[PDB]
Design a binder for this molecule. Sequence first.
Ligand code: CLA
Ligand code: CLA
Ligand code: CLA
Ligand code: CLA
Ligand code: CLA
Ligand code: CLA
Ligand code: CLA
Ligand code: CLA
Lengths: 80, 39, 165, 126, 741, 37, 63, 144
Amino acid sequence: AHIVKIYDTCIGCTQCVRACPLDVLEMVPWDGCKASQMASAPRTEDCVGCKRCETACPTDFLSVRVYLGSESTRSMGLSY
Amino acid sequence: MKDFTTYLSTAPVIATIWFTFTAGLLIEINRYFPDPLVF
Amino acid sequence: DIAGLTPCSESKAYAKLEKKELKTLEKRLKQYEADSAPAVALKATMERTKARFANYAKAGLLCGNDGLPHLIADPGLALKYGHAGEVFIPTFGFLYVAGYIGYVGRQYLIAVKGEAKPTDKEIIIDVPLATKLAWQGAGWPLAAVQELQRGTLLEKEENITVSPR
Amino acid sequence: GMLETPVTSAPIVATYLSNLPAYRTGVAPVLRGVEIGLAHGFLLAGPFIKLGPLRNVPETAEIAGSLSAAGLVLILALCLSIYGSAQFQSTVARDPLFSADGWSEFAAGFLVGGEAGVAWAYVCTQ
Amino acid sequence: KKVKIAVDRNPVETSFEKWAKPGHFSRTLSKGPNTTTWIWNLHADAHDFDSHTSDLEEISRKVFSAHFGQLGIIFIWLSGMYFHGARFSNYEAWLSDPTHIKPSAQVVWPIVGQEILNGDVGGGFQGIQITSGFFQLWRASGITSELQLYTTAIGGLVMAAAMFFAGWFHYHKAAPKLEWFQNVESMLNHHLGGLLGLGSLAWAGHQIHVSLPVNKLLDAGVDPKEIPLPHDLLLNRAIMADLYPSFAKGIAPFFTLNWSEYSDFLTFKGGLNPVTGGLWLSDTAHHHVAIAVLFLVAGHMYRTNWGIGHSMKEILEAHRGPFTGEGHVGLYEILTTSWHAQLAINLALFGSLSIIVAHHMYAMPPYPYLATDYGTQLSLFTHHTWIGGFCIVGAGAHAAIFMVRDYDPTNNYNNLLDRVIRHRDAIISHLNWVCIFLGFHSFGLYIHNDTMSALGRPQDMFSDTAIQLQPVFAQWIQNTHFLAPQLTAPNALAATSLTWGGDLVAVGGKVAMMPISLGTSDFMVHHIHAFTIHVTVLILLKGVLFARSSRLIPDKANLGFRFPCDGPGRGGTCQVSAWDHVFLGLFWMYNSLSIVIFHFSWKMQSDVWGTVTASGVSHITGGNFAQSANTINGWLRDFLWAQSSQVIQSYGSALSAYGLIFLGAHFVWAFSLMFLFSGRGYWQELIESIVWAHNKLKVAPAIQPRALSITQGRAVGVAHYLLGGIATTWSFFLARIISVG
Amino acid sequence: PFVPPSWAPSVFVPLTGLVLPAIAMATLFVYIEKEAP
Amino acid sequence: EVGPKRGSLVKILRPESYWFNQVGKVVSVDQSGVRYPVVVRFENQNYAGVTTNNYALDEVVAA
Amino acid sequence: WTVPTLNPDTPSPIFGGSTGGLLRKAQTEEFYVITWEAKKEQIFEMPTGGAAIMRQGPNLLKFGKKEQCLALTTQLRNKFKLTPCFYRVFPDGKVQYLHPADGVYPEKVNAGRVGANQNMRRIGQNVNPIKVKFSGRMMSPAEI
Ligand code: CLA
Ligand code: CLA
Ligand code: CLA
Ligand code: CLA
Ligand code: CLA
Ligand code: CLA
Ligand code: CLA
Ligand code: CLA
């Protein structure tokens, strides 16, 4: 499975969660930013690695990173 | 007229006029001084 | 002379090539009239060929075994045997015009960088400023040397972005 | 859900497919292999006989074609055996053909049937 | 329901204010540039009218005015061709000797030694030998002097000014409404009757009154100066009556249904003119008359403002069978509201028509002294073929654009389009299998022949001497067409063309047209053509059907029509957009059309074109197509290596320019490989280092330099690939056909 | 002497070209698709 | 009152930032104990088209 | 809020069928089932290709992968303003609720969610790969 990591530079804009096409990320309460929210990846077994979340992240540098790992039926997005 | 001059000041028009001027100068130099190889 | 070459004024292959070019031009001219447009154009081409060969031989160029002129790029040989007009003088001429263009462009960028929208001036060229800088760029070597000596030509390392290594 | 068409839903083609040995579901796999091998070897002997490099020389075109078809049947039998070994390794009614022993017997039956079909096609031209 | 002229007065004010604000048409580009990408975007979305606004009326108005601008450009180009033929050509000299004087209409200035390009074309003229065929067209129209061409050039300039004025007037002063553009019935009626029918009738009138008598006197040996002027022929009935006796009766036999009296200038001769080598102008005039009547009849089919006529919506809705569900329901609304769907249909039929034009033009030469001009024939066939292929790829592109932007599932519940998208997997899978079958059975024959020839076994090859594959169907069709004038065409004096069979027609010692025999090599190259066309169709169809969704990316429609990818996920989703399918289809179209033009060139130079001697005909290549086109080595040696001699040794002559382009075209094509095999990440980092060097010397531009986008990189690569390859073939073909033909 | 017989190529070339690659491909194919316990 | 003054120009010290060693205008500084309270706006956009970012107190220097 | 239970006897939208449906993976590995409530009969676009008609009330559909279910969820939420939910079904009959996992959509923060895969540092603070070398397998410095 791919490795999805969230960093402390996240501003809690929830743009990465809305851009995820397989429901891998979510928002959890936090205290390190004004939005009082932080991105999380509790369902990385369903991540395909499209990196749409990185495209939707506005922080410099990115707060969410996807490292392509082992490949399975779910990570390869195979319907067969 | 101000807008027309501003349009003429755009990069493609300026590049076209400048390259036409430079090419014309080189062509006229080679026409009045045919086959220049050395100084 | 240099590299075992011979002057074009004494090369037999040079004169042979001139005769060959004039021969093919005359052969093409033999099929037309004597007072028509192709005849006049061919005669003009023949005169241009003769003038070009005489001018190349008069310039003192060196010809090889093929009868074609050969250029000398070494400054010592060029200045010692009168070949500076091949590669030396055109070198400095190009350096002057190239530095002219580069200096004018750099001056324009520095001039428009202190405005409200420099990108707008980059896409829509300010003709009066560009013309003034183009005319003032004649003293580009002196101005460039002065800028280099004052330390204003380069930018400090702390003001230039770099990768995280 | 799926797309149904008269080509895949006609009862005539369904009966024709069910009548084939591969879709019998209840006979011995070795018998199925023998039938399939005979039906394949008989048709396989043709191209090598009429188009091989020795197709113009007489009294040996059929010999070379039949030998080539026999070699192809042997290669196909080896392919069936390795397919069965690499497909069934662990774990209506279940067809016994889709098993290690079933597919091995099927491959052996295919080899015997294919060689018999090639030999029968050779003598049929004499 | 009412067809009328709906126009809004002064919608857009004519001003130069927006000329100084680049990117005003786009909301994103109106902000201004910050990076260099913006500049490219400024040109990539200039004509994307549906992307600037969602108002169909504004898009239609912009399209209509853009059409006027295009017609003005075309009129300027035509006027330039007529002006060049009237002031810098040898048309008048070529008229007195069209079999020896080479057509030329371009002269270069004597600068930097380029005057060598002004070759000796004949007639006491020096210039560049043209291959557009304007000389033959002007001779067919009856033009005998440069004054007529000059007058036509001035008229073309006037027409161009009128086209530009029409575009400005229709965009800024009187802009048509949306309901005016949606009158497909009225538009089709006018285009069928008025445009096509009236144009054919007017051209038939010109041919009957100008082309036929002038060309009859020209073929009879009369000097062009002694031939009466067209107005003199149109003013008195004595000259026309002497040339055509039926003119003595006037237009009376036309109204009394005595059309048979006009058989002197309206015939069914067929074949070709033995004097000029082209089609009989009486046949072309009669052809245009019949075409005009047929199109005029066709222009009275649709309902506009009266009860009579047809409603295309009713016709489409009435066609419904048990195997297609609803049928053509919603197709009328799709074609009356989406410009991309109409562009797709029009581009497909337009490209197919261009290819048909190329074939019919080489087979039945319609202009005098056109068949013997091998350079013009080869250039015309190749040019029209390329235009047709490009238009076909564009048709696939716009079909995909419609499917991505204008498709609506609420109007396609169970129509033909809905069912096609439902079984797109089956369609693509079967087309994939037939493509693989065709590739094996077409290319494997050549590979087998190459291997057998190299192994010293020519008896095992797929040739005429060895195992043969004769095209029995094509040969039977050829025999049927050759025998048609005796049983199935009693009124036809000869066949439509000489390619079917019969005797050869030669003009000036050169074979104008002779029968074309088909053998094993023809069969193999035809299957090669079928395979290449099938693969191009597969890529374009796959890009259209899977443009909205697929098993890999279920929401592709949300990503748009032109997007680079969807990330390296799912194993990699590089080039999934329909744009990338068009990008690959361009390469396949180039491959297909290149093999097509190669086959045409070799077949014509081997079995058709050549000189005529005493008791025998000698071809250009000596008839080596039937023996060498069955192997790849034969195409590489006898066609590519042997015929490229003329372009590589062209230096020092008038064709040297072709050789230069032949080298330049090899450069551009290779240049394409830099953009097609690389990615923008490397270039962006390299640009970062160059920007560092610029920042060090305070010469960093305000507009941040960015590497080309992924889509732009693919577009640049395919553009350079197509330009380099087509220019290479163009230089090779023109140099070879001008030097030996 | 180490000289091979005259019939050595007629036996070794078909072996190395068809028998050995078939055995190697079959054994390798079985090894690649073998499932771990 | 903690952090740089609003509207002042600062230099970015974050190595992985696109605007490293570049000057940007200060927009606002958060008064809580957040990790990156300084908001900096830049004239040149990054590769993602963004012109603003958040930085810590020690990641920006008055330049 | 409580986890819902799949109702296999739920009507499916009116669709004539297509070739982009389920494959052998649904019968041997797993498949997905999406259910939603529609206020009225409406024509929507199927993620596998084609146009279907959702009926008034409950609607059930089957897909081969989770991406198809989420694409349909996004389409139903953004266009018709509905609230769909899906499950992963195994051949043995096991049903696993997937989205929204906690009953609330992940774009909005909800109490009770425990953060996972969160690094309390930035990217620039990651160590070099040499410090991660000779580990159990290929490991990136971000994994530690
Ligand atoms: C870009 C690289 C380059 C290269 C590869 C050369 C190569 C050469 N140069 Mg040279 N030169 C260059 C740049 C270069 N030069 C530049 C930029 C200048 C301007 C300052 C000169 C000015 C120059 C002069 C004035 C002379 C040479 C000479 C020579 C030749 C022999 C001397 C030598 O090798 O030492 C390297 C060259 C130098 C260090 C420059 C000084 C010259 C040294 C001291 C040798 C001179 C002594 C004597 C003339 C040697 C020849 C003896 C006899 C055959 C007459 C040699 C082929 C000599 C020559 O053969 O005359 C025809 C000569 O006198 N060059
Ligand atoms: C001098 C008269 C005139 C003036 C002042 C304007 C002014 C305006 N027009 Mg307009 N128009 C005119 C004539 C004029 N037009 C004509 C003759 C036509 C018919 C073609 C049109 C059709 C037209 C349309 C359809 C539209 C406008 C639009 C506009 C507005 C903004 C676009 C613009 O001009 O940017 C400048 C654009 C250009 C300078 C591009 C010129 C391209 C020409 C036509 C083609 C050149 C072909 C080229 C030579 C061949 C390429 C080969 C290459 C190697 C060079 C603007 C207020 C647009 C608008 O209102 O936005 C909503 C709109 O879409 N015009
Ligand atoms: C007998 C009537 C008639 C004729 C001859 C034409 C002819 C033409 N139309 Mg048109 N059209 C008509 C009726 C007609 N239309 C009606 C009734 C409608 C409304 C339902 C339309 C709506 C329409 C649209 C939306 C478009 C056309 C377009 C075109 C041009 C296609 C370009 C081409 O390939 O042709 C060959 C080119 C030529 C033959 C050049 C010669 C052009 C001359 C001037 C003939 C044009 C005659 C035409 C009736 C204009 C006279 C009106 C008068 C006020 C000046 C063409 C010239 C396209 C276009 O706009 O092009 C600019 C296009 O987009 N037409
Ligand atoms: C669009 C096609 C076209 C055109 C324009 C013409 C035109 C012409 N044909 Mg023709 N023709 C055609 C097609 C065409 N044809 C075809 C397809 C055939 C094959 C069947 C023929 C076969 C044919 C024959 C056999 C003959 C002609 C002839 C003629 C000429 C005289 C027609 C006639 O007899 O009286 C027709 C009368 C009219 C058309 C009415 C004229 C209307 C005028 C212009 C109205 C002007 C009014 C205006 C207000 C005036 C005020 C002026 C102002 C300054 C004050 C004429 C110039 C004859 C000829 O040329 O003799 C050698 C002739 O013998 N044609
Ligand atoms: C009647 C013909 C026609 C028309 C009206 C259109 C119209 C349109 N096309 Mg289209 N297309 C066509 C034919 C046509 N196309 C053909 C024949 C092809 C196959 C090549 C395509 C393939 C195609 C693609 C892949 C795309 C479009 C797109 C578009 C839309 C955006 C405009 C645009 O392309 O940007 C502006 C136009 C340009 C920047 C022109 C580029 C200049 C080229 C590269 C030069 C070609 C080389 C030249 C011939 C040689 C010159 C020599 C050189 C040294 C100077 C627009 C509505 C785009 C779209 O829909 O957006 C989403 C899209 O991406 N078209
Ligand atoms: C794909 C094109 C193609 C075709 C049509 C052929 C055809 C042929 N090759 Mg050849 N070859 C090819 C490619 C091709 N080759 C290539 C690419 C190479 C280089 C690697 C070679 C190298 C090569 C060599 C070295 C030799 C041949 C030889 C031969 C001949 C005999 C081969 C043979 O008997 O095999 C047997 C064929 C089969 C066992 C299968 C037949 C195919 C059947 C008919 C298809 C069944 C489909 C059916 C309709 C489906 C029914 C469905 C339902 C109704 C049941 C034969 C005419 C031999 C020769 O020299 O000729 C004298 C020979 O020695 N080829
Ligand atoms: C790497 C060295 C090498 C190479 C490239 C070749 C190549 C060739 N040999 Mg040769 N051979 C070699 C070593 C080599 N041999 C040695 C050391 C001996 C002495 C025992 C022989 C004895 C030999 C005979 C008797 C014959 C050939 C023949 C041939 C030709 C037919 C193809 C073939 O493989 O036949 C078979 C080759 C062998 C059976 C020798 C292999 C024995 C070594 C010890 C095993 C090598 C294992 C290998 C490195 C593992 C990698 C292979 C694979 C798993 C990746 C071919 C050109 C035939 C010929 O001449 O055709 C005209 C033939 O009759 N060879
Ligand atoms: C590198 C090793 C290799 C060897 C030794 C051979 C040898 C042979 N090939 Mg072959 N080939 C090879 C590689 C090889 N090939 C490859 C890599 C390809 C793909 C490019 C081909 C493609 C090919 C084609 C298309 C054809 C051949 C044919 C032939 C036969 C020549 C027919 C002949 O004139 O004799 C006379 C033939 C006979 C007397 C009949 C003998 C029948 C077989 C060989 C004997 C019995 C089989 C044996 C018991 C079982 C072997 C299986 C084994 C692997 C377990 C010959 C025995 C031709 C052929 O098959 O003939 C019909 C032919 O059509 N080959």
